[PDB]
Amino acid sequence: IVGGYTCGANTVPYQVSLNSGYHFCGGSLINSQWVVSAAHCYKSGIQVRLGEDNINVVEGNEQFISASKSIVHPSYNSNTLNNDIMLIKLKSAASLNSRVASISLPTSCASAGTQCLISGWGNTKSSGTSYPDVLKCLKAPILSDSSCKSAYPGQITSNMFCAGYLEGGKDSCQGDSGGPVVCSGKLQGIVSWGSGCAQKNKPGVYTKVCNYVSWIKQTIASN
Ligand SMILES: [Ca+2]
């Protein structure tokens, strides 16, 4: 997260860290045994880390649970990043409390102008690299479908929306991938891709979760 703020320990209780020896992606807890992330975060040997603030220090509210199964969306296209979503089932159910909680799935798609909260442990600098150890937050609006398509000609599908600032300065970045975009208490997006970070006229692009509610629900009900 570039140009964000320090969230505060456990103020984003649905945020998860995916770990394969090191943090490599974010995700969101949607019930006691399932995590949603980006399909481009796929790999084998994932451990899901819940209740994290400082990802380098054991602070007392963590739960570490291995993944038992990962399901990449059936139509994921790694070249275009269309359908950039994936579900991960946990080996055992998480213990839900005030600091580890699920986030509701949306019943309707959010409109442009809606203010959202984006969070992650990604790079905080638009040139160079500095990776934070504690969770960073960003308030950003959803941008109009027309300004999004004008920023990225030929690359935006109906499964994507843009959020952020056309002036630049504030954005998600490398290592925020797979993390949540939450608007009015509902999971509306997944950190997917961008052109660099926080560059002028290049806002971040996010997977449009409201398009996938039926697939998520049916997948969970049968796995
Ligand atoms: Ca920790």
UniProtKB/Swiss-Prot annotation:
Cofactor list: Ca(2+)
Broad class of where this protein is predominantly found: secreted
A single BP term in Gene Ontology: proteolysis
EC number(s) per entry: 3.4.21.4
Enzyme kind, highest EC tier: hydrolase
Record entry for activity regulation: Is inhibited by scorpion cyclotide trypsin inhibitor TopI1.
Keywords: Calcium, Digestion, Disulfide bond, Hydrolase, Metal-binding, Protease, Secreted, Serine protease, Signal, Zymogen
Pfam families: Trypsin (PF00089)
Tissue specificity annotation: Synthesized in the acinar cells of the pancreas.
Post-translational modification: Subsequent cleavage after Lys-125 leads to alpha-trypsin. Further cleavage after Lys-170 yields pseudotrypsin. A cleavage may also occur after Arg-99. Not sulfated on tyrosine residue(s).
Residue span, Peptidase S1 domain: 1-221
Binding annotation for substrate: D171, S172, Q174, G175, S177
Catalytic activity: Preferential cleavage: Arg-|-Xaa, Lys-|-Xaa
Cofactor binding note from Swiss-Prot or TrEMBL: Binds 1 Ca(2+) ion per subunit.
Positions in coiled-coil regions: none
SUPFAM superfamilies in the cross-refs: Trypsin-like serine proteases (SSF50494)
Entry annotated with the keyword Secreted: yes
Active site: H40, D84, S177
Entries under InterPro entries matching the protein: Peptidase_S1_PA, Peptidase_S1_PA_chymotrypsin, Peptidase_S1A, Serine_Proteases_S1, Trypsin_dom, TRYPSIN_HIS, TRYPSIN_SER
Subunit structure, interactors included: Interacts with SERPINA1.
Record-given protein name: Serine protease 1
Annotated organism of origin: Bos taurus (Bovine)
Gene this protein is translated from: PRSS1
